[PDB]
Design a binder for this molecule. Structure first.
Ligand SMILES: Nc1nc2c(ncn2[C@@H]2O[C@@H]3COP(=O)(O)O[C@H]4[C@@H](O)[C@H](n5cnc6c(=O)[nH]c(N)nc65)O[C@@H]4COP(=O)(O)O[C@H]3[C@H]2O)c(=O)[nH]1
Length: 146
């Protein structure tokens, strides 16, 4: 529904700090590592021991994406599978499932590029953010064999 506990969307790292997912030092550590590694603060922060669900959950709050409680519940369809292919889905990291409100529902494991494809499609589509473990398996759901 709705949540609010004096959170701050000032920065990705801060967003997690407000919730208390990572230690104050964890943020600085991941940040400093990004300057030497040049990787994503999120993926680099995970090294501290942060769960994927948390790293992705924050991305949805900062990127304003819609996170999926799960994948097993999702109901895939053939029509949606026509939008993107198995290999093509990996090209952008998105996978269709169905349509709602005259829009195309596509679950991708990359909210950062959500706008990249959203702008390329030039059409009304609902972009969700699901874990890499659930999003990967979803491929079998959206792309049923035979
Ligand atoms: N002092 C400080 N600085 C901070 C903190 N958080 C971030 N930063 C620095 O700002 C840039 C920009 O970060 P944004 O908050 O604009 O957001 C991220 C995020 O949207 C996305 N990202 C980051 N990590 C991941 C990831 O693991 N997966 C995905 N899908 N997207 C990810 O990229 C932008 C860019 O952020 P960067 O991590 O490239 O760099 C940060 C920090 O340099 C903070 O708390 N404190």
């Amino acid at each position: 529904g709705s949540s609010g506990e004096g959170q701050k969307d000032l920065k990705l790292g801060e967003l997690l700090l407000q919730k208390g997912w990572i230690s104050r030092e964890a943020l600085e550590e991941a940040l400093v590592e990004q300057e030497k590694t040049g990787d994503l603060l999120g993926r680099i922060l995970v090294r501290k021991g942060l769960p994927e669900e948390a790293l992705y959950r924050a991305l949805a709050e900062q990127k304003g994406l819609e996170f999926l409680e799960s994948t097993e519940g999702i109901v895939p369809d053939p029509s949606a599978a026509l939008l993107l292919l198995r290999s093509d889905a990996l090209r952008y990291g998105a996978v269709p499932i169905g349509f709602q409100n005259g829009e195309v529902e596509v679950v991708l494991s990359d909210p950062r590029h959500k706008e990249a494809v959203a702008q390329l499609l030039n059409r009304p589509a609902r972009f969700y953010l699901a874990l890499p473990q659930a999003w990967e398996e979803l491929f079998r759901r959206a792309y049923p064999q035979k």
